[PDB]
Protein: Heme oxygenase
Amino acid sequence: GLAVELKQSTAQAHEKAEHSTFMSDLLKGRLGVAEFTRLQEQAWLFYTALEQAVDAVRASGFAESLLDPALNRAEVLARDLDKLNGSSEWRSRITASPAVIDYVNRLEEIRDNVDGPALVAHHYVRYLGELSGGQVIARMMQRHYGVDPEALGFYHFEGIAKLKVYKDEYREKLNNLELSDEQREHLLKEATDAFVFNHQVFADLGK
Ligand code: HEM
Ligand code: NA
Structure:
């Protein structure tokens, strides 16, 4: 089933992602709110690009049940960032890192070419990752740095009653998505590429 193959084909990359210098330092309480904020600003840029690609691919009729609009993060993130930065000025001030530029370019390609299987891979990497682990990151931002949970709405999914039931449903949706052999190989390749993009974002953030 595709869910298991996605997990297994990216397991090594997931492990590298848990041990990136920036993300490891952040979660162990060795950085600070400033660094968490920089993370969230870059995330806002790529979630914005991701959600345009989602919208396009959903509109095309591909993977519609998987592409649940309750997952959308960009607007919630912007409200977090308003709280973290003290105003809405950051929107006009932030600049994409080179890795974020590259990720945003790929997401815009996926959007404009309506690359459904690519989009689903990036959807899995982002949303199932935040569904799974985002609770932990949020708890640690609060515990290590005193971030108010009002600035942690990104890690809370309001439209989702029960996360464990949700993740099971999501995996089952992956398992039922009708794909040609070539579309499936592309989806799996793209999931690897999504982690590499993520790894380069964290790399830039630690530099
Ligand atoms: C930032 C880059 C990360 C990405 C893109 C990401 C992505 C993912 C994905 C896609 C899954 C689902 C695996 C599956 O069941 O198919 C997952 C699970 C998980 N993630 Fe990550 N992850 C990242 C970082 C982290 C970090 C730093 C931690 C440690 C706090 C973490 C903790 C976990 C744990 C414990 C699970 C197991 C399932 C669960 O907790 O419900 N992740 N992640
Ligand atoms: Na291209």
Q: What stands out?
A: The two ends are 39 Å apart (CA to CA). DSSP finds ten helices and no strands in the chain.
